[PDB]
Design a protein around this nucleic acid. Structure first.
Ligand SMILES: [Mg+2]
Lengths: 51, 101, 95, 199, 55, 492
DNA sequence: CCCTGTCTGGCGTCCTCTCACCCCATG
DNA sequence: CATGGGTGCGCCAGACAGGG
């Protein structure tokens, strides 16, 4: 009952340079949005750095 | 019986084989257009919205017919003449028919 | 993913109790149950000690009722002619 | 084949060249068989299930008319109890005797003995009416039915499908706002408000 | 398999309404911190800390 | 209907030469099986067909048994005898059951069981009548060619198989080709191919010669041995009891016509025909044909023969890839060593020198006396130890005392050699002395003896450190064995 | 014969989905 | 059994009379 479809990055089609395109499958009928939204909001701000 | 192995067979034959979608009152030639199928869990033809302005198709209970080009010359005519990417201008004038509705 | 995972590490010898049952619990035909009661066989432990040749001497017990008794005993893992040492237990001798 | 014509050898009949084949039905619908009717043109042998349906409907109509008599007799005896509250009332003597004789108790020639005579008329009418109507209902169940030219028996089966909802059905309000329902979303994707409830 | 069984649909789902309301934090002297207050709505079959732990 | 059963039984009995009884027993079993399939429950069923009417009664059979394991098909003897006192263990109790209505299903099942009964009766009797064919060269039509086998049709629903190893290396068969081969094995695969056919084995050659040479079929000439390299070369050895018949000439035929017919059927296989001799040396000379043999030396103890040939004939005697010597060795049953006359003399000189060195070393005799023993035919210490005293006393210069002393020295030399090897490894001396310590396997005893620990005393004198390098011996196991050895040697 | 009134013919969107019912009548 | 006989459409258009 706690067994889901554990996913994986099937490919990293890094298009050209300083640009990647990472596809992850398979997730549940609803987990693509929650992982996309979680990673999108964290990368946007939380991720530190210098400028 | 529809066993577990015929759905991979089906995703093999559907690939690169266009079909002719057709609204029932076809008035001009943009009312028969050829698509490539994408399989649907369901019982309803999913039709790309821009193409609806060509068919005069709203979604208030409309029905469409699908036809299969059997022979090889007919698959090539569906891809090279009747494909929906090829009909982006109305033949009555110069105005685009894939206008966003 | 490392940041989001670090933000979640604070969350994550008379057989057994079957021998003590009455013969009526065996779901036998009304004929087979009444034939066994006429011979003073009250418990499953009494029935299991009797041989097939002894049960066939019982008045009105037919070959069909004997097959029914075997099939039902076999469904419970019991067979006719098992010897139980110390049957009946002293807990049953007073009814 | 020799073996096909050897149908006669073991049993009889004739040859087996004839295409043996059982009328099997097509697909597209599920269901649950809720009701089976069997009608028989008169003269034809009723099989065992047609006699099962005949015994079943005999039993149902027997129980139903007997409950008509029992329920209306219960109302009639309640009327007798309501009348005998006054005028020669027997508080203890009323339920010592069997209930079908609630008329010969101590009471003079009034409207109440007249009413008990009228209820006795109604009761004997219900008795003889129940006799003749149960005989007529056994006649209606037992008889055959006039049917098509050259048909033995008609079997009607009622499948009961339960169709839920899916992308493609048509819903509409009461003002002309039609629409094919296009996607059955999960619960989480719905726009919710600052209370918590999804639309 | 027999004709006497009856199959109902199965809604294996204990919760009904999950509403979070973020709000400002003052317990810690440090500001620009937040509190996450989640009001769930269970039907009684699931403990709330067990629900947040499984999630 | 009725008379039709009799007409079918008579037609099938006459056409398949089969007992009517066996057909009815099988129809009864077929109908019982067809009946069992109409019930949702596993029942036992007996069918009985009346032999005059063709009418049949079907029962619920109840196998009378002592202990009932299957209440749906079995009944106790006590319960069976309650219905009929005449019943015994193994009989059937019946139950009035609707006879399986014959239609097209029962008809097809009956047809299948009849066909199967004919395979186990008509076809079985045909194979019994063809006892010759089961062993001789059967002829079949190629039905199917697979990678690993060829299926042959023999007619009458008989299928045979030629395995890949049973084919000639250059044969290519097509479906519809006619193929001959020897039926070398009959197994029990009725469904499929129970018959195994060979073209590669020596029996194919023998039977081709039996057919092509009337004198072999009439038992005037006997084939004593056959050796074969399939599709390349064979040798056959022939004998006759009639001194008026040349057995080689008879098998060759006029201008080789008979041997060429056999060779052609075998895809151009070269066949040598040799005269069988009762003298092994003369038979090997004949088997070595076409190479001329100069001398033969026979070693009866090793079952080997050294064949000397002229240096010009060496390549012919060996043959291409050793084919001639190998076929001669397989035909004679002897191991055949082919060498030059010069090499044979050098081998004998080396063996004589090794025997002289052995006798000089172990018997404490001079080289002159050792040479006399080798010239009189003694090559081993065993011969000198065990040969009858009369043969040693026939040697010029040996007296009874000297022969006794020579035998005692030979026995003592044999004893010493055995003991030395048994102590060096773990054959007997270390397999008893060093292996006395409980726990010593034969391998460990030989590992100990390779370090010079040959006795239980030698092991009792060791430290754990002296044994630490022995593969499979832990310090604890070494310590236990040394203590066990000390307990026996010093405290026994 | 040159114009006028009448008389008959020919015709009127495309796909679908159910239903109900198909010649009396009788010497 | 087998056979035997309504009266709410409107325009166009050309052929057939019908005057003219
Ligand atoms: Mg529409």
């Amino acid at each position: 009952v706690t067994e889901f479809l554990k996913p994986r990055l099937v490919d990293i089609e890094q298009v050209s340079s300083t640009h990647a395109k990472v596809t992850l499958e398979p997730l549940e009928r609803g987990f693509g949005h929650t992982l996309g939204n979680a990673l999108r909001r964290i990368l946007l701000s939380s991720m530190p750095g210098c400028a | 019986r529809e066993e577990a192995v015929v759905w991979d067979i089906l995703d093999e034959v559907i690939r690169e084989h266009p079909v002719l979608l057709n609204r029932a009152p076809t008035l001009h030639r943009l009312g028969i257009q050829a698509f490539e199928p994408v399989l649907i869990e369901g019982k309803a033809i999913q039709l790309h919205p821009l193409v609806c302005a060509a068919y005069n198709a709203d979604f208030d209970g409309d029905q469409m017919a699908v036809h299969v080009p059997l022979t090889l010359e007919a698959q090539l005519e569906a891809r090279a003449l009747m494909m929906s990417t090829n009909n982006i201008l109305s033949p009555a004038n110069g105005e685009p028919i894939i206008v966003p509705s | 993913a490392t940041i989001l995972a670090e933000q979640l590490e604070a969350f994550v010898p008379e057989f057994d109790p079957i021998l003590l049952r009455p013969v009526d619990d065996l779901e036998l035909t009304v004929r087979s149950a009444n034939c066994l009661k006429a011979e003073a066989i009250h418990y499953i432990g009494d029935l299991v000690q009797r041989t097939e040749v002894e049960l066939l001497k019982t008045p009105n017990l037919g070959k069909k009722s004997l097959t029914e008794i075997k099939d039902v005993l076999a469904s419970r893992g019991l067979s006719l002619g098992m010897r139980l040492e110390n049957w009946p237990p002293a807990s049953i001798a007073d009814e | 084949t020799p073996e096909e014509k050897l149908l006669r050898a073991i049993f009889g009949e004739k040859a087996s060249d004839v295409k043996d084949s059982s009328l099997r039905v097509p697909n597209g619908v599920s269901g649950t068989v809720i009701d089976v009717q069997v009608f028989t043109r008169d003269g034809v042998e009723k099989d065992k299930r047609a006699l099962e349906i005949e015994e079943m409907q005999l039993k149902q109509a027997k129980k139903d008319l007997s409950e008509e008599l029992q329920i209306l007799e219960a109302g009639l005896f309640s009327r007798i109890r309501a009348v005998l509250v006054a005028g020669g009332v027997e508080a203890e003597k009323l339920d010592k005797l069997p209930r079908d004789r609630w008329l010969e108790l101590g009471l003079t020639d009034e409207e109440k003995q007249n009413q008990l005579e009228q209820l006795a008329e109604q009761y004997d009418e219900l008795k003889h009416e129940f006799e003749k109507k149960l005989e007529a209902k056994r006649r209606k169940i037992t008889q055959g039915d006039d049917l098509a030219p050259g048909v033995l028996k008609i079997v009607k089966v009622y499948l009961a499908v339960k169709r839920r909802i899916q992308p493609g059905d048509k819903m509409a309000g009461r003002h002309g706002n039609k629409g094919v329902i296009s996607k059955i979303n999960p619960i989480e994707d719905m726009p919710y408000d600052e209370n918590g409830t999804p639309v | 398999r027999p004709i006497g069984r009856l199959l109902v649909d199965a809604c294996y789902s204990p919760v009904e309404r999950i509403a979070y309301n973020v709000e400002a934090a003052r317990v810690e002297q440090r500001t620009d911190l937040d509190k996450l207050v989640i009001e769930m709505e269970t039907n009684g079959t699931i403990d709330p800390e067990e629900a947040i732990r499984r999630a | 209907m009725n008379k039709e059963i009799l007409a079918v039984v008579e037609a099938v009995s006459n056409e398949k030469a089969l007992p009517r009884e066996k057909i009815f027993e099988a129809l009864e079993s077929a109908l019982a099986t067809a009946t069992k399939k109409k019930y949702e429950q596993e029942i036992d069923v007996r069918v009985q067909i009346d032999r005059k009417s063709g009418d049949f009664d079907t029962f619920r059979r109840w196998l009378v048994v002592d202990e009932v394991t299957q209440p749906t098909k079995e009944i106790t003897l006590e319960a069976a005898r309650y219905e009929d006192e005449s019943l015994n263990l193994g009989d059937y109790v019946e139950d009035q059951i609707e006879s399986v209505t014959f239609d097209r299903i029962t008809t097809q099942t009956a047809k299948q069981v009849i066909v199967q009964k004919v395979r186990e009766a008509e076809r079985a009797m045909v194979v019994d009548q063809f006892r010759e064919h089961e062993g001789e060269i059967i002829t079949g039509v190629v039905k199917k060619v697979n990678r690993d086998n060829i299926s042959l049709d023999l007619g009458n629903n008989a299928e045979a198989v030629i395995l890949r190893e049973d084919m000639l290396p250059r044969e290519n068969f097509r479906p519809g080709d006619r193929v001959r081969g020897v039926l070398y094995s009959v197994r029990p695969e009725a469904r499929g191919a129970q018959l195994f056919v060979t073209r590669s084995k020596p029996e194919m050659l023998i039977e081709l010669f039996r057919i092509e040479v009337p004198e072999i079929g009439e038992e005037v000439i006997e084939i004593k041995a056959a050796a074969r390299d399939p599709g390349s070369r064979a040798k056959i050895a022939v004998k006759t009891n009639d001194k008026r018949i040349d057995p080689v000439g008879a098998c060759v035929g006029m201008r080789g016509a008979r041997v060429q017919a056999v060779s052609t059927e075998l895809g151009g296989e070269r066949i040598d025909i040799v005269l069988w001799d009762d003298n092994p040396a003369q038979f090997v000379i004949n088997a070595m044909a076409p190479a001329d043999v100069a001398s033969i030396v026979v070693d009866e103890d090793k079952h080997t023969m050294d064949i000397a040939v002229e240096a010009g004939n060496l390549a012919q005697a060996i043959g291409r890839n050793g084919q001639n010597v190998r076929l001669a060795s397989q035909l004679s049953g002897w191991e055949l060593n082919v060498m030059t006359v010069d090499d044979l003399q050098a081998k004998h000189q080396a063996e004589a020198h090794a025997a002289i060195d052995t006798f000089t070393k172990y018997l404490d005799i001079d080289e002159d006396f050792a040479t006399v023993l080798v010239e009189e035919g003694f090559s081993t210490l065993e011969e000198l130890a065990y040969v009858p005293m009369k043969e040693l006393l026939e040697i010029e210069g040996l007296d009874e005392p000297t022969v006794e002393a020579l035998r005692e020295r030979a026995k003592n030399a044999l004893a010493t050699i055995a003991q030395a090897q048994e102590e060096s490894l773990g054959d007997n001396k270390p397999a008893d002395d060093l292996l006395n310590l409980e726990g010593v396997d034969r391998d460990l005893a030989f590992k100990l003896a390779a370090r010079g620990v040959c006795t239980l005393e030698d092991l009792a004198e060791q430290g754990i450190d002296d044994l630490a390098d022995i593969e499979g011996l832990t310090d604890e196991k070494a310590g236990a064995l040394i203590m066990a050895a000390r307990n026996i040697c010093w405290f026994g």
